[PDB]
Amino acid sequence: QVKLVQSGAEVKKPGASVKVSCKASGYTFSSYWIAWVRQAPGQGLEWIGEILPGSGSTNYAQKFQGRATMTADTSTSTVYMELSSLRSEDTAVYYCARFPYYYGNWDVWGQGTTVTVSSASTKGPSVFPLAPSGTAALGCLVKDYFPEPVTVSWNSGALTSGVHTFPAVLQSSGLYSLSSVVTVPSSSLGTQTYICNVNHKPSNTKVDKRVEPKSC
Template identity: 55%
Template structure:
């Protein structure tokens, strides 16, 4: 079974950059799609984007396109979500989730990374 372990909570200032991680184990990483999900305080879940760990296919939601970058490092079975210039509105909980290639459901989830952006 897949295990996803995310990096810890972050407190940042507006304008700062950040890269959060999601380390996978228990399954062949190159056979997975990794999705990132945003949950703003008191709100619902939103798919931000997904990346195929076995290749370069990356797909972003129009709401975050150009605002974040999703990447993977296959050598360490880790996916990333990064910002070059944070805004207060980026404050949220971020989850990574895995899809086995060929399936259309996220069967395993990370524990979440809480991001607070405040001056």
């Protein structure tokens, strides 16, 4: 019943601002500090700042002072962190968490808010065939899309054996690329047809691509 509920996922451009909300219940809102901590991708937690809703006193990590503002509204049991001049490095899951001061621990945490800061815009992929050469490997290169995800099937779902769709790389441009490959018998390459079905919902893209064995 002590509980913190945060606003939803956010996607922003560099230079924009984001404002995340944290709604508290199950305790006396004015008398406990609430903090914000972020988890950047991979590993690492980092403290941002804290606010005591009762008094409005704040403490910020020096790194964030002037760029992060925390506010609290006793009439709604809600605290807000606003972070301005977003940069790519601000991409992270942001948490609010209650911070009993006697031991200086965050005992209850919100569910997290994913903040993606990217200069990219919604974009469907270019698909290129990866020509093969007793088995062989062929695939498709699904290049330069945003955001995740893309799905891939082979021969409209008729071919699942030996299909391996690899997780995407995230390029410094902000776009993703992935590859899907299928390993098939070599005798079948000139008879059997191979088509990869690349669906990217956010952009409404559906491309089907024939993968031909080549000049050899």
